[PDB]
């Protein structure tokens, strides 16, 4: 029965039942169907006109909430003597949604998802305290965020030609400005994203497992447009993503064990319960014990 | 008995005298790809009776320390009959599956099986950062066993696995389970050798027990491909 549900269903009054051949409270779990027993059939009920709305559990409302997807700190300074491992006034991030547990677990409640993303970038700056540096003050810098799709070259320096962005989508924003905000469409080459992928990425046997090639996004390169200054600073960029226009398919069991990696669904659990490999739920003394027993 | 059912599907057939019902995943039936959802412009091959038929896999022994078994589709059916030949000679396929799990015992036997079809059952490893390898995932007709059926081998819970299309084999009640799975995928077709749409898992939630003479109690699995299509014909690649 497909219908429009805006409120919880009402209750109807019921009377004494004693009829042969009818056993509403008896079910068959083996069929794979949930019990269809009604409260009106198990107890004697009254008429209740239920006015509880159900708009808060809509998948759109459930998932349309900005969540931290990226957070990166780098030093904005003179990087002449820095090693070839630090972010020299810029960084690149391979976009993914598996780095922060809250959004990952919310998204992984479904097998397939189709949505547009709303990207918000929030930048903070702090004055470096290394050595004998003082507060000085916080400069108002300009940052450039460029989206490099798959196959496009990514910048290697803070002043490389790639930043001219002839066709790549870039956003220039100040720290004193509100957080930058854009919208990315549903970029999948399929009709929906694959939250879980029971396959391998390549045509050979050495490809990655569990990552769908169709769901590849690209890179987000963030640089400071300003040239360095006599004193060093630490710039932290946070990227939040909000799904919208969502369609969800095949809900899944929630994850109980802590996440181990962003590349796979590997599990080891906690040392003791709750959420341990051998005991998800915390233990009680026996099946005849309740911990929070009201005693008076 | 509790229910009777017959499943023809080609030149094969199955009769069950002690069944509960059969499950249609999400209340849907397999169908051929329509023109308004097609992608590949090549004319497909639809063998029908040659591929849409029951294939029976090797049986597994139902012991006391059994943790469960899984078979990935179409990986399990690849290399089996005309369906396997069509998979090997073609680059894309598309098919539903009618799954029949068989297990019988006596009336002095107790035990409960959860038979669940997980869509896109991406597995995880235990106590390691490395991802599962090709040999860990691709087991063929023999399938695999569950390392930790408690978490479904992916860090989730077995208790919530009833959200997926499932049935039970309760020895006290029935001896067979039937699930009809349509085509489940984000794409209209797919390469059969690198991705599994479905995983059939049979898990011993209630262990087998009896106090009469012990006998081998096997579990048999028969999968019938349904509405099979194939595109991208070239040499066999296996």
């Amino acid at each position: 029965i497909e219908s429009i549900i805006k409120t919880a269903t009402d209750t109807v009054k019921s009377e004494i039942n004693a009829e042969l051949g009818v056993v509403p409270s008896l079910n068959a779990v083996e069929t794979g169907a949930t019990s269809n027993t009604e409260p009106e059939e198990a107890i004697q009920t009254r008429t209740v006109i239920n006015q509880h709305g159900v708009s808060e559990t809509l998948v759109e409302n459930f998932l349309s909430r900005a969540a931290l997807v990226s957070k990166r700190s780098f030093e904005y300074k003179d990087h002449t003597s820095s090693t070839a491992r630090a972010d020299k006034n810029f960084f690149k991030w391979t976009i993914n949604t598996r780095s922060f547990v809250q959004l990952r677990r919310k998204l992984e409640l479904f097998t397939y998802l189709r949505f547009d993303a709303e990207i918000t970038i929030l930048t903070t700056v702090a004055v470096n305290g290394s050595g004998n540096n003082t507060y000085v003050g916080l400069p108002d810098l300009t940052l450039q965020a460029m989206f490099v799709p798959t196959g496009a070259l990514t910048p290697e320096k803070q002043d490389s030609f790639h930043w001219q962005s002839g066709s790549n989508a870039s956003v220039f924003f100040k720290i004193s400005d509100p957080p930058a905000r854009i919208t990315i469409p549903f970029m999948c080459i399929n009709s929906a994203y694959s939250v879980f992928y029971d396959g391998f990425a390549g045509f050979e046997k050495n490809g990655l497992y569990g990552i769908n090639p169709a769901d590849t996004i690209g890179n987000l390169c963030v640089r400071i447009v300003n040239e360095h200054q006599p004193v060093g600073f630490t710039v932290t960029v946070r990227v939040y993503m909000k799904p919208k226009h969502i369609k969800a398919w095949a809900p899944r069991p929630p994850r109980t064990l802590p996440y181990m990696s962003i590349a796979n669904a590997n599990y080891k659990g906690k040392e003791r319960a709750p959420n341990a490999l051998s005991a998800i739920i915390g233990n009680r003394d026996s099946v005849k014990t309740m911990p929070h027993n009201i005693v008076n | 008995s509790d229910r009777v059912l017959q499943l023809k599907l080609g030149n094969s057939a199955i009769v069950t005298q002690e069944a509960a019902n059969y499950c249609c995943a999400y209340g849907e039936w397999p169908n051929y790809l329509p023109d308004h959802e097609a992608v590949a412009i090549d004319k497909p091959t639809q063998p029908e009776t040659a591929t849409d038929r029951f294939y029976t896999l090797k049986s597994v022994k139902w012991e006391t320390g059994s943790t469960g078994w899984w078979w990935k589709l179409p990986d399990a059916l690849n290399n089996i009959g005309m369906f396997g030949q069509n998979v090997q000679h073609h680059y894309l396929y598309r098919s539903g599956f009618l799954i029949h799990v068989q297990c019988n015992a006596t009336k002095f036997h107790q035990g409960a099986l959860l038979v669940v079809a997980i869509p896109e059952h991406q597995r995880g490893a235990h106590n390691t950062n490395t991802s599962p390898g090709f040999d860990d995932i691709m087991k063929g007709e023999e399938g695999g066993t569950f390392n930790h059926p408690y978490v479904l081998d992916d860090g989730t819970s077995l208790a919530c696995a009833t959200i997926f299309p499932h049935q039970w084999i309760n020895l006290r009640t029935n001896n067979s389970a039937t699930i009809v799975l349509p085509w489940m995928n984000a794409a209209p077709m797919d390469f059969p050798l690198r991705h599994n749409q479905w995983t059939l898992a049979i898990i011993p939630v209630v262990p087998l027990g009896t106090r009469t003479t012990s006998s081998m109690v096997p579990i048999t699995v028969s999968i019938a491909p349904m509405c099979c299509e194939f595109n991208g014909l070239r040499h066999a690649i296996t």
Binding site: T31, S55, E60, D116, T183, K244, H245, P251 | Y26, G27
Partner: peptide, 30 residues
Amino acid sequence: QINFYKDSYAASASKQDFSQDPSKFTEPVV
């Protein structure tokens, strides 16, 4: 709401889909 943008995916969340079919998960039998 306002959506003066030329692309339709730039609009805001569409929280008005109140249709549902729970029986596809609760009674998926015949």
